């Protein structure tokens, strides 16, 4: 069946999803993630959207403001809105899957609620495709592809010009923060390109 | 984050071997998530950070893939021109253009709520403003508006069956990331992926540009420009966040450089050493590189030359002889707390002293603090990520190369003194410092080993577990957060593919309301520590053969 989602866990607990379509396949994935890592995922959702001070307090206000200032939510929603129905299924499947398991947890919290929700004094909320996309955007795009120190480099360069004069300041800048160094060990051999 | 891919000509008893060690810090519950997906065109196994829809590490029975951070320059800062009068406007292509703005309310548990405004221009969100210059800085990313497409390219690549299909997906990944390929036929490939700006002539990408119009990127460079190799003449692909190719410019971070001193050399040395490598030998490079001191190799020749005319009773000569006798591999003593050899402690003190006399001295305060680190960092919990060669140390390496270095030495870092004299003075400092704490008998120096901590707070500094959930490993290992190995066409099996991984502490982070920990909460922790690994299953018969449970759902959209 097309309605059927079979979940097989191995000897390490690693889940394997058997499904006939995209929505059913990602639903399965979402469901086991909510089983295994709900508190982690929930905290990762608040970290990536700047909503930590709500449940954690005063100490996270600066964190929250810094997260929010580094993105444009509306630009993310517009990319979601432009997806094709097959692409959209992946994200919707996933959020739906998770929600399925959050509903059981919130229905029977005496046995299903992750201990840490009790510790931290809050409960899980339902997810939407925007939430799933923000997990990737916030921890892959902002962690490993958002690197610059250009304003700081300019400050440094200004200090070198005040020390060695204009031309000399610039040549020292190139000794400390060169653009390229032709002796750097490379992944692709020079014969290749 | 390291990777080594071994092709047909270098592989022994297989056609292709892929070993990946993505380095993201050590966390509890695991940074990555193990998952197999069978249906709707997908047939994959692997693990991936934060259970993203697409698997960063894994295989589909035909091809295997992996990644390492790219570090290309894909972000530039635009100095936006504001008017004192007419506010929330900026000058662009001779017109006063209005900024996008949004108000935000920060709700606070047990405190007052707080609201602020976020501003945006054609160039990107505003970072900071200087109302004295009447300048605002907008951060411009080459991947702005391709965030969602990057995620989907990472998902659709799981279905590729060849290089041709695989690179069609690589072309849509817009973040600065290295992508790696291996297949059942022994083919191996590499792509430095990402969206890179087509800059205006004379644009120095290390420093801000005016955002008034003339400095605006021309667009993005085509994918034909992205460094890539397919079936390299060497028979292998190695990376440890080093330069992809000759003359490729790195990130503009002051603290990031691609120079002659690079930790990828440690991997190359080992892969060139044996004509062919088996899977166990390929796995084994994780153990060696985990334990290797990164500075030994770079500065031993320098220290040897400087102490060559010294007497045996000279303590500064003694210290160099200790290092000469050492292979650079750190091993714990029986006590589980100290290192067998004092080499790393010696190099750490020496290098700090050398930096203070050379690089630090040439830079004005407080920019001098950027170059003073030796790269031996740590606290009680050990390093937060990988060990690398510090920026100061890469700059000092070029200086000690003299004229063999391609980097023009505008200021002589040795400030008119012969090199040997600065080296010997730093060695005297080393001896004075270390002898004071450990005594004069270098042979009984019991130096502190670095440790490993699986942190309860995620990389942002936000709790993702209770504080008590924090795990500790005695030996610090400079390796992946997870390690995965894929072996194509073993001669050893009937199976066309073999794959292994380790996801510590475990698969599950579940703790029941009563304090009952899942069965799979920490069953991979000891395996991690002793360089062990678990089998990754793909086919139905393997999955069936190893099943521990089944759950069937009947759902309709
Ligand atoms: Ca830049």
UniProtKB/Swiss-Prot annotation, chain A:
Domain of life: Bacteria
Binding site for Ca(2+): 150
Protein name in UniProt: Penicillin G acylase subunit alpha
Swiss-Prot record, chain B:
Chain positions recorded as Ca(2+) binding sites: 73, 75-76, 205, 252
Active site (record annotation): 1
Domain of life where this protein originates: Bacteria
Official protein name in the record: Penicillin G acylase subunit beta
Encoding gene per record: pac
Covered residues, full protein: 290 to 846 of 846
């Amino acid at each position: 069946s097309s309605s059927e989602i079979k979940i097989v866990r191995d000897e390490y607990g690693m889940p394997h999803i058997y499904a006939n379509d995209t929505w059913h396949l990602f639903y399965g994935y979402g469901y086991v993630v909510a089983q295994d890592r709900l508190f982690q995922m929930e905290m990762a959702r608040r970290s990536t959207q700047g909503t930590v001070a709500e449940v954690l307090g005063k100490d996270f206000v600066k964190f929250d403001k810094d997260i929010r200032r580094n993105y444009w939510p509306d630009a993310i929603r517009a990319q979601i809105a432009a997806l094709s129905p097959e692409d959209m299924s992946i994200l919707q499947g996933y959020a739906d899957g998770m929600n399925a398991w959050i509903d059981k947890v919130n229905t029977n919290p005496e046995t299903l609620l992750p201990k840490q929700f009790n510790t931290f004094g809050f409960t899980p909320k339902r997810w939407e495709p925007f939430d799933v996309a923000m997990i990737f955007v916030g921890t892959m795009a902002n962690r490993f592809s958002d690197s610059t120190s250009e304003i700081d480099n300019l400050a440094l360069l200004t200090a070198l010009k005040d020390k060695y004069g204009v031309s000399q300041g610039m040549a020292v800048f190139n000794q400390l923060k060169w653009l390229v160094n032709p002796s750097a060990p490379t992944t692709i051999a020079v014969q290749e390109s | 984050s390291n990777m080594w891919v071994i092709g047909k000509s270098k592989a022994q008893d297989a056609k292709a071997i892929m070993v990946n060690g993505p380095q993201f810090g050590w966390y509890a519950p695991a940074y990555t998530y193990g998952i197999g997906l069978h249906g709707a065109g997908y047939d994959v196994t692997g693990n991936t950070p934060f259970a993203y829809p697409g698997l960063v590490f894994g295989h589909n029975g035909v091809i295997s893939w992996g990644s390492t951070a790219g570090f290309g320059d894909d972000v530039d800062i635009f100095a936006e021109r504001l008017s004192a009068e007419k506010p929330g406007y900026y000058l662009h292509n001779g017109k006063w253009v209005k900024m996008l703005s949004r108000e935000e309310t920060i709700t606070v548990k047990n405190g007052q709520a707080e609201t602020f405004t976020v501003w945006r221009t054609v160039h990107g969100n505003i970072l900071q403003t200087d109302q004295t210059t009447q300048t605002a800085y907008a951060k411009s990313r080459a991947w702005d508006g391709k965030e969602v497409a990057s995620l989907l390219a990472w998902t659709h690549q799981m279905k590729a069956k060849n290089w041709q299909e695989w690179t069609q997906q690589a072309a849509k990944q817009a973040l600065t990331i290295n992508w790696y390929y291996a297949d059942v036929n022994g083919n191996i490939g590499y792509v430095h992926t990402g969206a890179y700006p087509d800059r205006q002539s004379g644009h120095d990408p290390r420093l801000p540009v005016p955002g008034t119009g003339k400095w605006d990127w021309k667009g993005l460079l085509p994918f034909e420009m992205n460094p890539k190799v397919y079936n390299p003449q060497s028979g292998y692909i190695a990376n440890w966040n080093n330069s992809p190719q000759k003359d490729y410019p790195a990130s503009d971070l002051f603290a990031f450089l691609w120079g002659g001193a690079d930790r990828v050399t440690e991997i190359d040395r080992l892969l060139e050493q044996k004509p062919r490598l088996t899977a166990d030998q390929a796995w084994d490079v994780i153990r060696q590189t985990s334990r290797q001191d990164l500075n030994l190799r770079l500065f031993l020749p320098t220290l040897q030359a400087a102490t060559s005319g010294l007497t045996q009773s000279d303590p500064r000569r003694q210290l160099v002889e200790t290092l000469t006798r050492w292979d650079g591999i750190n091993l714990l003593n029986d006590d589980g707390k100290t290192w067998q050899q004092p080499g790393s402690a010696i190099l750490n003190v020496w290098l700090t002293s050398m930096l203070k006399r050379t690089v630090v001295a040439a830079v004005p305060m407080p920019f001098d603090k950027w170059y003073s680190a030796s790269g031996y960092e740590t606290t009680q919990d050990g390093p937060t990520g990988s060990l690398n060669i510090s920026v100061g140390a890469k700059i000092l390496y070029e200086a000690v190369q003299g004229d063999k270095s391609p980097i023009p030495q505008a200021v002589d870092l040795f400030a008119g003194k012969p090199q040997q004299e600065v080296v010997l003075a730093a060695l005297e400092d080393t001896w004075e410092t270390l002898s004071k704490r450990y005594g004069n008998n270098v042979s009984n120096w019991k130096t502190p080993a670095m440790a490993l901590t699986f942190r309860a707070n995620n990389f942002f500094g936000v709790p993702q577990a209770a504080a008590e959930e924090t795990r500790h490993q005695a030996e610090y290992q400079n390796r992946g957060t997870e390690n995965d190995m894929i072996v194509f066409s073993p001669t050893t099996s009937d199976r066309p593919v073999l794959a292994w991984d380790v996801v510590a502490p475990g698969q599950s982070g579940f703790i029941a309301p009563d304090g009952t920990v899942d069965k799979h909460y920490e069953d991979q922790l000891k395996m991690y520590e002793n360089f062990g690994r678990k089998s990754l299953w793909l086919t139905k018969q393997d999955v069936e053969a190893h099943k521990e449970s089944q759950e069937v759902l009947h759902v309709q959209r």
